Amino acid sequence: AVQKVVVHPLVLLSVVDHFNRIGKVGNQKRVVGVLLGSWQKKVLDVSNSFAVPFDEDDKDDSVWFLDHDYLENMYGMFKKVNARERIVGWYHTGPKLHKNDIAINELMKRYCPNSVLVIIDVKPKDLGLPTEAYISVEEVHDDGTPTSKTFEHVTSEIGAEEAEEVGVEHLLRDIKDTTVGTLSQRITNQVHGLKGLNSKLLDIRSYLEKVATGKLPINHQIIYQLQDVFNLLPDVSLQEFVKAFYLKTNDQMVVVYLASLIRSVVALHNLINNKIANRDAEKKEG
């Protein structure tokens, strides 16, 4: 149904406010906020959101506390001031997906339309993208397990339309723009290996742990496609790609001729002014 979503940083800075208005009490649980957006178009666009007092139990996980009057009053007044945005779903700040999320999401599945779920981290130490759109749809399983709520990962992007780019750029004054060239390219080409190294290294360790020490079926069926796609590149002998290395290396030669020739053109004004300025300033100094 929905291919991609658009999440503005305003809601995540509202999660910064979720971490600001705590009051130093010692709970810091998965505070659930009422996510708002535009479900009209096929693409989802989050503009702003708000929160609702949400408290769980220490031992029992099935305890969840929501509010209907606060949702209808905040949504009623928010719709009165801005009717272009309506309820879409919710989101929790907890890093782990608990079992009670089917009951928490089930309320906004009954009263509200199909709600999207977003899992983020309480500490911004994760290098990866903090936002993951999880659609709440029921899927048929091939093994015969009963139909239940399944959270499929929907791709997400963090973009601002008109003003939040200006506000973020003015508040930071440290981040740089695209700036195609040497630095913005070589930084990605340096740290990219760590950007994949922390993800893969962080995932395959617990993966290999759950291979031998795993039960409660983790959908082992998708592991066959995992190792299949991993074995779709069986160390090609590079025999056919030699001519492609001749093409890319020939373009490399083109960049060699462009650099040497163009820089040789740049040497004109320098290697002329260095003489005509020094000898004339010297002969005319005294």
Place this chain on the structure above:
Amino acid sequence: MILDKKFHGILDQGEGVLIIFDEPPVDKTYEAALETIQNMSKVVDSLYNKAKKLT
């Protein structure tokens, strides 16, 4: 007609083998060679200005 370059091909007498091939990237060596020939005059004129100002 191959000497007239109306199509891609080449004949043979000993074996009679027909080969058809083409070279699409024609606009690379032309622009590169023109940049080399045009830059030759730049470096030579630079050596004329420096050779004039020195000796």
Place this chain on the structure above:
Amino acid sequence: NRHYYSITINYRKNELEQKMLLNLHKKSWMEGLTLQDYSEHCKHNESVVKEMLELAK
């Protein structure tokens, strides 16, 4: 300005806004897995950028 003046304005940013919003904006200019759109341009250098190299020349 008569009977109508103004006041100065300063800002404030803690480490949670600095790292969350900084990494959020860098990620907003980066990819999902950060390895997706690299080979796109690495292999577009042979198909699309060649036109930009010929026009550049």
